[PDB]
Design an enzyme around this catalytic site. Structure first.
Site, short mmCIF file in Angstrom:
data_model
loop_
_atom_site.label_atom_id
_atom_site.label_comp_id
_atom_site.label_asym_id
_atom_site.label_seq_id
_atom_site.Cartn_x
_atom_site.Cartn_y
_atom_site.Cartn_z
N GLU A 12 0.82 -1.21 0.00
CA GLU A 12 0.00 0.00 0.00
C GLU A 12 0.86 1.26 0.00
O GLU A 12 0.36 2.36 -0.26
CB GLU A 12 -0.92 0.01 1.23
CG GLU A 12 -1.83 -1.20 1.34
CD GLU A 12 -3.24 -0.94 0.84
OE1 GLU A 12 -3.48 0.14 0.24
OE2 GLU A 12 -4.11 -1.80 1.06
N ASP A 21 -5.19 8.24 -4.45
CA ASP A 21 -4.80 6.86 -4.72
C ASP A 21 -5.11 6.44 -6.16
O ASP A 21 -5.38 7.29 -7.02
CB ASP A 21 -5.44 5.90 -3.71
CG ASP A 21 -6.96 5.85 -3.81
OD1 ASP A 21 -7.54 6.63 -4.60
OD2 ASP A 21 -7.57 5.03 -3.09
#
Ligand SMILES: [Cl-]
Ligand SMILES: [Zn+2]
Ligand SMILES: [Zn+2]
Ligand SMILES: [Zn+2]
Lengths: 163, 163, 162, 163, 162, 163
Positions: A12, A21
């Protein structure tokens, strides 16, 4: 030294300032979704609530880890109270158990619990079949590289996909 | 490769057949209590129930780990639903969160929650102080060595006391 | 007049000012643990929180009973949500039920639930067997006199031991 | 020997065979309501369900005490999970805490939780005003004799209304 | 537009200031009991707490809906965590589910669960017999008109009574 | 006669025999996901378990409804036990509340709690802003038509999008 933190930190990524993101969603730390709303202001508002201080979009090392922990606890909790997940989780070894948390952490308990087949193969310790079956998922498709590493883990029961 | 399993394996030992623990209580696996009652018969009943078969006091490696995972889940579930314990836990790093789990696994969530000053110290990252405060408990007395290693873990945030 | 208060009052004692218990742990009222930490200041902190005022380590009678009640509720609550305990508990008479609450008050639900054998004997009402079995535990060892009385209550279902 | 059992036994009475209560509802043991439906066959169905055997509308002493206990547990559970009740309950003495339970046993947690004023007075040990204030309820009207005793228990802190 | 709000609005009525209900109990919004205590001051207390501001016994529409919704949530929660009720509730259609909610909103989950037969007949979709059976209750007797409409909802599965 | 049922029925469709949904996932009834696993046998397995009978991939009207009811209760449970969602849910009128449940039924409580801004705007009854804001999400993108109607409901407080 390998664990769920060091694992996810490289799946991540770890960032100390709010970023969009893969889906343009405001995020920070280790894959912590702040808000779906396209407002930098709302993100900071949520982050200020999360950290408990006026962060203005920037947090510390210790704070992102604290946020990560809250996320992980939510995932582990998700596993421990899903009747489809816990039994599978309980049959895995430490290293593999982390690959399950990594899955849940990414897509939620309901998402991971849908893998009816892979889940049984894993419980029966039929890793190789479990690997190819999971490789046939929307999950594997939208995020190939990460899925590879998680699946490799499941298959080997070691941290090789990360060392 | 270090984790809560390898950690607890060397603090609780790993035994494949029923033995009496430090207090004459029928035990197996990784410090898994079966019953306080002084009857080898009732212990195999509990063990038969737990494993789901006629074990006659003998279990396998996977069965021991499965049983361990169930005990750890109970320890983590103890920490998460404990208002005193969760905030501290969440503020700790990977390795140091293992130390806390170890403490609960040994003495239950309430027991650990009882360490008022030590807990706050850890949450404020005053490791050295926590170490000396923890070394002054009945816990440290009754099991000096184990506490030494766990306290060494809280203090350094590393696996040194095990690896 | 006999009940869990008067019963536990004489098994755990009733003290209006903080004191170190059998294990050097700061305590008050009826065996109410304040903190494992070796710092009377912390003890008085927790006590200030619990009582809702500046006690400086000293509380009243009513304040101690309030502190007792909260503890008992937690013992009962631990029994009523313990799959192993509740069925046993529900099979006991008023007096013998207190004897169970007593034990849980002393070692917790997971403690008492450990006595697998004695538990089944109690729910079956085979008192005398339950007595000898419980008389063989680390519990009976560490605290002989009290266990004696608690066990006696299980055996006779009366307040004779008190 | 006085307690919640002996207390409720004489306010609710103890019967070994199904009987209609004050409102024509099928009841048994110590005030254990079986069903609101006017069907003896429906009553015997619940009883067979509750006792776990073919009772044909007749139970034993121990079966009524087991039934009683489960109703007491439901009331105590009601109190301890009622934000309005637990703090008052925690502030009473063993004897008065019984009175409270008696009330909740008879009318449920919501009913008792309604007496807003009487509840405060009790938490402030102003017994004599709580008595008059409870003596002014529909509860005191519908069931005069029982209330008197319970209210007397609240006012004296002793088992006098039953001794 | 029909639903549980529009339904309960017309069974419990909607008032913006404290009033004594059928049993002389201080009430507000949609059948929201404030206190059984005969003190207008005690009721203004509860309300002020419930709303979170100095209301002096007067609220707004939105404050009465918010208070209504929380009341409905408590009802749905009672049904979903009661073993006797949820299977019956999960066997009903959208409309007939409102009728059950209603009942629990009026008399609580315990009271409704006390209707042993009428509950099984509902789960078995034997409406007509559930109708005659619910009409024999103390519930029907104490509040005839409201009971008619609710039961009627159980018998037709439509908002005809509303 | 409109309600969450008639609303979701026309958004998620109502089918009596297992079908692959938009993403090739085995589904039945009203958008009830059976399994992410690409196995018709697995889908029939889950289906048999849920319904509790030999279905061979076919269910009745009532069984679908029952299934739907369970799904809705899970969604409502989700809202009610979510601090971000309940207070907003409690602010809406009966009609708009059904729209929220609709979103939660589709994407779960976490995904809907993600819309930080839109939520608050709904709590403040600024419907028009919540409309535009929500039309800017991935949700509106992947499922344009459905979002339109749900967002229309939020804006008008009426069932017009479905009539
Ligand atoms: Cl040691
Ligand atoms: Zn939980
Ligand atoms: Zn509880
Ligand atoms: Zn719940």
């Amino acid at each position: 030294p390998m664990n769920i933190f060091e694992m996810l930190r490289i799946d991540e990524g770890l960032r100390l300032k709010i970023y969009k993101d893969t889906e343009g969603y405001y995020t920070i730390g280790i894959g912590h979704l702040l808000t779906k709303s396209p407002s930098l202001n709302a993100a900071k508002s949520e982050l200020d609530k999360a950290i408990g201080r006026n962060t203005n979009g920037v947090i510390t090392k210790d704070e992102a880890e604290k946020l990560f922990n809250q996320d992980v606890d939510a995932a582990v909790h998700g596993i421990l109270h899903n009747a489809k997940l816990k039994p599978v989780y309980d049959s895995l070894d430490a290293v593999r158990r982390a690959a399950l948390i990594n899955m849940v952490f990414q897509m939620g308990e309901t998402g991971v619990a849908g893998f009816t087949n892979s889940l049984r193969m894993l419980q029966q310790k039929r890793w190789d079949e479990a690997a190819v079956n999971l490789a046939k998922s929307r999950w594997y498709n939208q995020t190939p590289n990460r899925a590879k590493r998680v699946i490799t883990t499941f298959r080997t029961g070691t941290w090789d996909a990360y060392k």
